[PDB]
Amino acid sequence: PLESQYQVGPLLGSGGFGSVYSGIRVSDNLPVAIKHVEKDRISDWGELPNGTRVPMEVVLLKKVSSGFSGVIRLLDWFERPDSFVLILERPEPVQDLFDFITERGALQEELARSFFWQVLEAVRHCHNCGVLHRDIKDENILIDLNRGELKLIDFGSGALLKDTVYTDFDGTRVYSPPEWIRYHRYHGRSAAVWSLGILLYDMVCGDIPFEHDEEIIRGQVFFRQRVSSECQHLIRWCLALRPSDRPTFEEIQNHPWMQDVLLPQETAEIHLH
Numbered sequence: 001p002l003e004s005q006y007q008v009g010p011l012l013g014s015g016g017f018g019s020v021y022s023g024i025r026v027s028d029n030l031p032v033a034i035k036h037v038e039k040d041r042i043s044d045w046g047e048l049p050n051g052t053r054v055p056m057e058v059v060l061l062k063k064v065s066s067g068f069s070g071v072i073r074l075l076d077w078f079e080r081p082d083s084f085v086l087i088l089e090r091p092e093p094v095q096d097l098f099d100f101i102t103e104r105g106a107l108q109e110e111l112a113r114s115f116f117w118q119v120l121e122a123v124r125h126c127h128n129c130g131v132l133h134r135d136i137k138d139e140n141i142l143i144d145l146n147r148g149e150l151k152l153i154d155f156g157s158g159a160l161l162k163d164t165v166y167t168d169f170d171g172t173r174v175y176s177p178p179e180w181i182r183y184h185r186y187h188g189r190s191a192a193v194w195s196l197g198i199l200l201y202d203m204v205c206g207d208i209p210f211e212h213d214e215e216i217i218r219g220q221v222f223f224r225q226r227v228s229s230e231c232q233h234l235i236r237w238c239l240a241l242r243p244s245d246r247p248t249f250e251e252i253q254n255h256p257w258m259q260d261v262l263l264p265q266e267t268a269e270i271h272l273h
């Protein structure tokens with residue numbers, strides 16, 4: 001069934017999320033990514049409107065599934081004896097933001113603005129769907145190179161969005177907020193804003209600002225690259241130590257640095273050719 005409907009291509013990557021393969025849906029040659037997740041490694045299990053025992057990732061992907069291209073689309077899923085197999089859409093050609101930054105270095109601000117804006121729309125979409133990604137980072141962002149569109153992937157560390165405190169975290173530590181580091185306590189939106197500040201810094205500087213807990217806790221931001229004041233202001237704002245001092249998604253998107261964003265197609269034409 002999974003074996004007959006899909007032609008398995010090469011391994012795209014593996015890690016904490018499991019193993020993701022390039023693939024093609026045999027019926028219409030649709031490019032897909034086949035993600036295998038070991039059951040023993042699934043800590044968060046959820047229930048669909050049917051009531052089946054599935055990993056939370058599947059619940060979250062279904063909650064965020066729509067025509068909106070800013071988030072990876074779950075096309076299908078299969079349960080195997082010891083794993084879950086997720087069929088995800090696969091943009092072609094594609095490059096993750098991490099590989100993009102590794103190759104190109106620090107992004108021009110116009111490019112970072114377009115990318116960052118698309119990440120914001122994608123995160124806002126997650127949140128409107130009741131999903132907290134919890135692992136917003138360059139590696140979890142795919143660039144559809146032809147369309148200039150970004151896709152948020154890997155909902156495997158995610159949770160249902162709630163207004164109460166989260167005391168569990170399995171996303172990326174260097175993207176985690178100081179309140180998580182110090183107290184093991186964070187609120188969804190403000191931790192997402194912190195990780196967005198790390199991401200924005202990473203986009204415009206070519207690397208994350210903090211490598212150690214103490215740097216996270218201190219929250220002193222040093223710009224190793226020439227970054228505009230408006231951009232440094234937005235970064236410093238997302239990276240406020242006090243969760244309540246962080247901007248809301250609205251304030252980030254109304255920030256002066258975020259004005260006159262390029263359309264994804266314009267972004268592709270100028271920067272991804």
Ligand SMILES: Cc1oc(-c2ccccc2)cc1C(=O)O
Pocket residue numbers: 012017020032033035072088089090091094142153154155156
């Ligand atoms: C790790 C991962 O990689 C992908 C993917 C990679 C290249 C093209 C399309 C999708 C999705 C996920 C996921 O976890 O959702």
